[PDB]
Design an enzyme around this catalytic site. Structure first.
Site, PDB file in Angstrom:
ATOM      1  N   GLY A 144      -7.648   6.096   3.263  1.00 26.34           N
ATOM      2  CA  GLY A 144      -8.065   7.000   4.323  1.00 26.34           C
ATOM      3  C   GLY A 144      -8.013   8.476   3.989  1.00 26.34           C
ATOM      4  N   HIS A 195      -9.807  -6.086   4.880  1.00 24.78           N
ATOM      5  CA  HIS A 195     -10.097  -4.894   4.100  1.00 24.78           C
ATOM      6  C   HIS A 195      -9.050  -4.713   3.007  1.00 24.78           C
ATOM      7  CE1 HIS A 195     -11.787  -0.851   3.557  1.00 24.78           C
ATOM      8  NE2 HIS A 195     -10.555  -0.372   3.575  1.00 24.78           N
ATOM      9  N   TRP A 200       0.808  -1.209   0.000  1.00 21.98           N
ATOM     10  CA  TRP A 200       0.000   0.000   0.000  1.00 21.98           C
ATOM     11  C   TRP A 200       0.845   1.263   0.000  1.00 21.98           C
ATOM     12  CZ3 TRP A 200      -4.445  -1.748  -1.380  1.00 21.98           C
ATOM     13  CH2 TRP A 200      -4.932  -2.977  -0.888  1.00 21.98           C
ATOM     14  N   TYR A 242      -8.096  -5.801   9.822  1.00 21.52           N
ATOM     15  CA  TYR A 242      -6.890  -5.081   9.398  1.00 21.52           C
ATOM     16  C   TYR A 242      -6.588  -3.900  10.309  1.00 21.52           C
ATOM     17  CZ  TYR A 242      -3.932  -2.276   6.147  1.00 21.52           C
ATOM     18  OH  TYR A 242      -2.927  -1.536   5.566  1.00 21.52           O
ATOM     19  N   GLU A 290     -12.339   1.868  -3.871  1.00 17.63           N
ATOM     20  CA  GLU A 290     -12.368   1.032  -2.684  1.00 17.63           C
ATOM     21  C   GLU A 290     -12.003   1.904  -1.488  1.00 17.63           C
ATOM     22  OE1 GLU A 290      -9.661   0.133  -0.745  1.00 17.63           O
ATOM     23  OE2 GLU A 290     -10.504  -1.482   0.485  1.00 17.63           O
ATOM     24  N   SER A 291     -12.630   1.632  -0.341  1.00 12.35           N
ATOM     25  CA  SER A 291     -12.394   2.363   0.921  1.00 12.35           C
ATOM     26  C   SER A 291     -12.632   3.851   0.663  1.00 12.35           C
ATOM     27  CB  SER A 291     -11.020   1.997   1.474  1.00 12.35           C
ATOM     28  OG  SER A 291     -10.912   2.327   2.866  1.00 12.35           O
ATOM     29  N   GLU A 351     -14.080  -6.924   7.321  1.00 10.48           N
ATOM     30  CA  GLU A 351     -13.739  -5.523   7.136  1.00 10.48           C
ATOM     31  C   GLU A 351     -12.881  -4.981   8.277  1.00 10.48           C
ATOM     32  OE1 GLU A 351     -13.997  -3.564   4.679  1.00 10.48           O
ATOM     33  OE2 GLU A 351     -15.366  -4.567   3.296  1.00 10.48           O
ATOM     34  N   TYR A 382      -3.294  -1.925  -8.584  1.00 14.60           N
ATOM     35  CA  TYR A 382      -4.220  -1.196  -9.448  1.00 14.60           C
ATOM     36  C   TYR A 382      -3.771  -1.227 -10.902  1.00 14.60           C
ATOM     37  CZ  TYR A 382      -5.108   0.833  -4.752  1.00 14.60           C
ATOM     38  OH  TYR A 382      -5.313   1.020  -3.404  1.00 14.60           O
ATOM     39  N   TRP A 395      -1.047 -11.688   5.646  1.00 20.70           N
ATOM     40  CA  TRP A 395      -1.620 -11.448   6.966  1.00 20.70           C
ATOM     41  C   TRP A 395      -1.978 -12.772   7.636  1.00 20.70           C
ATOM     42  CZ3 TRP A 395      -1.056  -6.890   9.115  1.00 20.70           C
ATOM     43  CH2 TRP A 395      -0.890  -5.762   8.278  1.00 20.70           C
TER      44      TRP A 395
HETATM   45  N1  HI6 Z   1       2.150  10.599  11.227  1.00 27.32           N
HETATM   46  C1  HI6 Z   1       0.975  10.577  10.361  1.00 27.32           C
HETATM   47  O1  HI6 Z   1       0.693  11.545   9.721  1.00 27.32           O
HETATM   48  C2  HI6 Z   1       0.103   9.318  10.238  1.00 27.32           C
HETATM   49  C3  HI6 Z   1      -0.736   9.212   9.179  1.00 27.32           C
HETATM   50  C4  HI6 Z   1      -1.545   8.105   9.032  1.00 27.32           C
HETATM   51  N2  HI6 Z   1      -1.488   7.105   9.935  1.00 27.32           N
HETATM   52  C5  HI6 Z   1      -2.317   5.937   9.739  1.00 27.32           C
HETATM   53  O2  HI6 Z   1      -1.671   4.817  10.284  1.00 27.32           O
HETATM   54  C6  HI6 Z   1      -1.347   3.763   9.414  1.00 27.32           C
HETATM   55  N3  HI6 Z   1      -2.464   2.879   9.074  1.00 27.32           N
HETATM   56  C7  HI6 Z   1      -3.489   2.676   9.938  1.00 27.32           C
HETATM   57  C8  HI6 Z   1      -4.532   1.831   9.577  1.00 27.32           C
HETATM   58  C9  HI6 Z   1      -4.542   1.214   8.370  1.00 27.32           C
HETATM   59  C10 HI6 Z   1      -3.513   1.411   7.507  1.00 27.32           C
HETATM   60  C11 HI6 Z   1      -2.466   2.251   7.864  1.00 27.32           C
HETATM   61  C12 HI6 Z   1      -1.304   2.467   6.882  1.00 27.32           C
HETATM   62  N4  HI6 Z   1      -1.062   3.586   6.361  1.00 27.32           N
HETATM   63  O3  HI6 Z   1       0.011   3.740   5.473  1.00 27.32           O
HETATM   64  C13 HI6 Z   1      -0.648   7.190  10.997  1.00 27.32           C
HETATM   65  C14 HI6 Z   1       0.156   8.313  11.153  1.00 27.32           C
HETATM   66  P1  GD8 Z   2      -9.542   2.867   3.382  1.00 29.61           P
HETATM   67  C1  GD8 Z   2      -9.629   3.207   5.200  1.00 29.61           C
HETATM   68  O1  GD8 Z   2      -9.570   4.155   2.637  1.00 29.61           O
HETATM   69  O2  GD8 Z   2      -8.064   2.314   2.960  1.00 29.61           O
HETATM   70  C2  GD8 Z   2      -7.582   1.023   3.137  1.00 29.61           C
HETATM   71  C3  GD8 Z   2      -6.800   0.992   4.456  1.00 29.61           C
HETATM   72  C4  GD8 Z   2      -6.672   0.692   1.936  1.00 29.61           C
HETATM   73  C5  GD8 Z   2      -6.611  -0.818   1.738  1.00 29.61           C
HETATM   74  C6  GD8 Z   2      -5.251   1.230   2.143  1.00 29.61           C
HETATM   75  C7  GD8 Z   2      -7.231   1.328   0.667  1.00 29.61           C
END
Ligand code: HI6
Ligand code: GD8
Ligand SMILES: *[C@@H]1O[C@H](CO[C@@H]2O[C@@H](C)[C@@H](O)[C@@H](O)[C@@H]2O)[C@@H](O[C@@H]2O[C@H](CO)[C@@H](O)[C@H](O)[C@H]2NC(C)=O)[C@H](O)[C@H]1NC(C)=O
Ligand SMILES: *[C@@H]1O[C@H](CO[C@@H]2O[C@@H](C)[C@@H](O)[C@@H](O)[C@@H]2O)[C@@H](O[C@@H]2O[C@H](CO)[C@@H](O)[C@H](O)[C@H]2NC(C)=O)[C@H](O)[C@H]1NC(C)=O
Ligand code: HI6
Ligand code: NAG
Ligand code: GD8
Lengths: 539, 531
Positions: free
Chosen positions: A121, A444, A85, A334, A201-202, A331, A132, A436
């Site tokens: 997110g 997810h 990712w 993860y 997605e998401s 869902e 993709y 995983w």
């Molecule tokens: N320091 C930050 O800005 C920051 C941003 C986003 N997150 C989110 O944490 C990671 N994460 C959390 C949940 C699911 C996937 C993921 C992977 N992201 O690359 C943490 C810190």
């Molecule tokens: P969603 C919360 O937008 O994103 C999930 C974590 C991902 C698989 C990275 C698209």
């Protein structure tokens, strides 16, 4: 010889040179990294995208351009399940480029267009991610596939509402601009601008839904697919004042101003900050430690979204619209390894009752104690209140139901009731290659590789049935793109996928077995989330 | 003259009657006065002990039923008339009954004391279904039952007033229990081995004597059938009791607590009965106007509070419920219900029914009830809605209060045995859709199937004998079980939550008294109402 003309295309801005991709089934033409906006750099940070000004000569669209500046996940460094990712191009604010895949040779008659919007997110993601890769869909089903990069994090979604200098939602405008690009330019690649199917997605699925609900976008496409996301999810939008609070705290944490004041002055100070400095402080503005909550997300300010997505969903007339929606089987799992006490990919995560109750506040942040109690009531098995394995599955269900399953279900049922033909799925196959742990089930994001046909990649080691399965799913998605109906035109024998309706609530399971029809997208659980809990929050 | 039928108790002499059963004779002493008639100036007052008499009291027939409403919803229907008064109504009603083996036992015999139910507004010890002869003959216990004042006569309260202090019907029961302590030995009964048992409001009464120190030294074991003192219907707050008593006065033409009670005391008893049901704050089922009041005296706190604070080591209780606690009540107010059709109600009727069956709660609380009890895959199916609303009423009023009592008592030192009664009587006159309704385990506990003039099956008689044996075993030892070979009835605990089903099959141990539904009623919904 000279030049490859199939790899040459003229779009309203100037001339493009593409590349011929080998796929297992034959060649595809790819135009990767087409500029569609002026770079949102320096003074243009936080502002709406400006259309790409025209150019002389030939732009080489021959490789993916840079990933929009974003956080890079460090929880499991080198681990495949997380690295897939993460950015696979260099980070830069200069990132507003889209990609077009088309059959080789270019179609004679207009061909329906799938437009991909990645998730992550709203703080991460890129169209260049290996999973993709558009070449397999395009070869298998002879559609045109488009994907775009859009700004994420503060760069896409920091909002000081009312301000001209940081209006919010510019990442959504990035997507809208690309959709306008598809309308003006996709015919030059042989695509049909009158048959455009968004899918994502998401957060991409939430993005797709917001384009449904914003009239200036709604005219740019004809069908939608929302995978494991919805615009009404509790994480997908934020109110104006909480957006301002987060922007203001972000600025404060990076020394702007040297809190609040003039919006023009504050954004100007923010523009002088190194991109990475902004990224390093983004998570600090979240009101509490949580999972499935993101700092800078679309803002409900009356412009892009005239009302909240739930309001707009309830009020909408959706006749003329076909929609395909769905979720994966697990869902929630993860997200638990990113903060829920007692969870790890590297053990069984057999949590205690005390850890479960703590995780409920992490998974359902910023609700009253009473509301938290209602969650504990529904998700506790009171014959087995402290069984670890049941508590692990229950917390997974809490996070998944709250954030994905019940928002999707509410969208599906409202759209069906109000005149849209809806199809719903639950994706239930756990890839043989999944890195995983087993307790996470089908997490997810792990249907995407099958939708895109990634198992057809020779370099990969999927089973031969998984390759058949991927081909089935690609056919469903492209059938829906072409006709608004995933069902294979004139093929009885093969079980039918029925429309989802608010009453019967039918959906199909997607796995190696043939389609099985079932009822209710977690109906008992989602009645709590969609009907009861909102009444409690009012009172 | 039969000397077995002559007994001298503290107040004087009594003449009983020999009764026949298929297993042989029994001695009965029916209509023994235990209090001064609570008439005229004594209406609403605590009972006073019966003053001694000369001569011989005729104790050969049941005495009057305490003044009470008579059900009229299905005139002549067996399923309702079996609970209606079967002797004349009178305020002169404080009599009790003793059944004993024949000849009278000559060594101390364990005593069962029956307290009838009837929502605290009705009931009588003379009802055929409470006939003590079969239990006494088969299990060789002494059985006592008393009449206590019901409705306004027993429970109208103007709190802090001494003209109408409230809870005097409970004091009627206590006085009878005091009478048992002093006089049961004259019948062969053992005053050191007294087991209270009761059903519905009688079970609530039992629990209340558990939780009131002056009653607690008058018995040793307790059986609570389909009722509990923490039921939302079993008690009333001081302010609401005062409001109800004040509205009754107005409704009968009466105007200071003294002048109010005085005027009430001039009214024919039947006049109070006629307006009794109209002081309820809303249309409802399973709610009763004049019930025990929490005022610091008889109950120093709410039964809930008293249950949580109590040390119950050394207490054994037998508690349980029928399979379908709610169904019976739905024909007395739930829209769409009738004993004479399938009661296949609408979603609209169901939702209206929820506010009848869960009266006086906020809309949010009602919404929470509707959420838990809707099958959202079948939200409008009539059969499921009928069964769901019976569950709402049965869980709210009986099952979950009993579950709460059981778990707290067990976790706080008591030995608890729990049952679900799942046999539908072959003679049951209510329709099939009501299942095993409220009240219809009693005829089996009292061994009525043994009566040859009634139409029970051979296996039903054997079943009644098993039940009588469990109940009397519990009275004798605090444990319903027999020597092994036979499946054992395990204690109920807060963790394992084990109970047995009672039917024609051998005991089957199961887990959870509707644990999912009762978590809602016992854990979540109090928190909701707090906010
Ligand atoms: N320091 C930050 O800005 C920051 C941003 C986003 N997150 C989110 O944490 C990671 N994460 C959390 C949940 C699911 C996937 C993921 C992977 N992201 O690359 C943490 C810190
Ligand atoms: P969603 C919360 O937008 O994103 C999930 C974590 C991902 C698989 C990275 C698209
Ligand atoms: C399962 O793992 C979690 C997460 O801990 C990480 O992963 C483990 C495999 C191990 O390598 C730990 O050292 C890692 O930190 C465990 O919960 C953590 O426990 C430690 C110390 O006990 C604590 O400092 C952390 O805060 C905990 N993490 C939380 C609460 O999220 C958990 O104990 C493991 N379960 C087992 C071993 O049964
Ligand atoms: C089932 O019966 C109820 C109860 O109604 C009474 O009893 C019936 C057996 C029959 O004799 C009815 O005429 C009686 O009124 C029915 O509910 C009643 O419906 C009528 C409309 O016809 C309405 O006016 C009453 O208010 C209703 N009573 C209550 C308590 O809700 C119900 O409709 C019957 N179910 C059927 C016929 O399917
Ligand atoms: N004294 C009265 O006016 C009166 C009226 C009605 N009821 C109760 O009759 C209904 N009923 C009768 C038998 C069993 C249950 C029920 C319903 N309870 O809510 C008692 C007194
Ligand atoms: C912010 O400061 C700039 C710089 O002079 C000024 O032009 C602008 O009007 C100010 N905005 C507000 C809202 O005060
Ligand atoms: P409960 C509410 O006292 O019910 C009584 C005993 C009956 C008349 C059997 C319904």
């Amino acid at each position: 010889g000279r030049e490859d003309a199939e790899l040459l295309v003229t779009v309203r801005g100037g001339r493009l040179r593409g590349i011929r991709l080998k796929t297992p089934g034959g060649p595809v033409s790819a135009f990767l990294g087409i500029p569609f906006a002026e770079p949102p750099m320096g003074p243009r940070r936080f502002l709406p995208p400006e259309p790409k000004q025209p150019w002389s000569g030939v732009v080489d669209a021959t490789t993916f351009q840079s990933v929009c500046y974003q956080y890079v996940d460090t929880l499991y460094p080198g681990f495949e399940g997380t690295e897939m990712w993460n950015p696979n191009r260099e980070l830069s604010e200069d990132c507003l480029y889209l990609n077009v895949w088309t059959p080789y040779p270019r179609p004679t008659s207009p061909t329906p267009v799938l437009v991909w919007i990645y998730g992550g997110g709203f703080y991460s993601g890129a169209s260049s991610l290996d999973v993709y890769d558009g070449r397999f869909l395009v070869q298998a089903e002879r559609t045109v596939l488009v994907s775009m990069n859009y700004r994420v994090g503060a760069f896409g979604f920091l909002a000081l509402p009312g301000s001209r200098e940081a209006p919010g939602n510019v990442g959504l405008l990035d997507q809208r601009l690309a959709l306008q690009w598809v309308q003006e330019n996709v015919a030059a690649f042989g695509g049909d601008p009158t048959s455009v199917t968004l899918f994502g997605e998401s957060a991409g699925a939430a993005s797709v839904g917001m384009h449904l609900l914003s009239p200036p976008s709604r005219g740019l496409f004809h069908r939608a697919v929302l995978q494991s996301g919805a615009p009404n999810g509790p994480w997908a939008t934020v109110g104006m004042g909480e957006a301002r609070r987060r922007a203001t705290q972000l600025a404060h944490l990076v020394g702007c101003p040297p809190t609040g004041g003039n919006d023009t002055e504050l954004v100007a100070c923010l523009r002088t900050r190194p991109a990475q400095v902004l990224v390093n402080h983004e998570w600090h503005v979240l009101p509490q430690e949580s999972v499935f909550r993101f700092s800078f997300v679309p803002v409900v300010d009356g412009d892009f979204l005239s009302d909240t997505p739930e309001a707009l969903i309830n009020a909408g007339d959706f006749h003329g619209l076909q929609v395909l929606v769905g979720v994966v089987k697990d869902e929630g799992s993860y997200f638990l390894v990113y903060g829920a006490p007692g969870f790890s990919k590297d053990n069984e995560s057999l949590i205690s009752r005390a850890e479960f109750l703590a995780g409920v506040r992490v998974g359902v942040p910023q609700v009253s104690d009473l509301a938290a109690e209602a969650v504990v009531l529904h998700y506790t098995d009171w014959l087995h209140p402290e069984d670890p394995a049941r508590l692990r599955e229950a917390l997974s269900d809490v996070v998944g139901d709250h954030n994905v399953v019940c928002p999707v279900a509410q969208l599906a049922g409202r759209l069906a009731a109000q005149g849209a033909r809806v199809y719903a799925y639950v994706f239930e196959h756990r890839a043989s290659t999944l890195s995983w742990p087993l307790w996470m089930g089908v997490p997810h994001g792990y249907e995407i590789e099958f939708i895109f046909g990634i198992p057809l990649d020779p370099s990969r080691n999927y089973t031969a049935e998984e390759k058949i399965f991927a081909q089935r799913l690609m056919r469903y998605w492209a059938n829906f793109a072409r006709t608004g109906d995933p069902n294979e035109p004139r093929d009885p024998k093969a079980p039918q996928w029925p429309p989802y309706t608010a009453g019967a609530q039918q959906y199909v399971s997607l796995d190696l077995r043939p389609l099985e029809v079932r009822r209710g997208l977690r109906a008992q659980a989602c009645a709590f989330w969609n009907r009861f809990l909102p009444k409690l929050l009012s009172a």
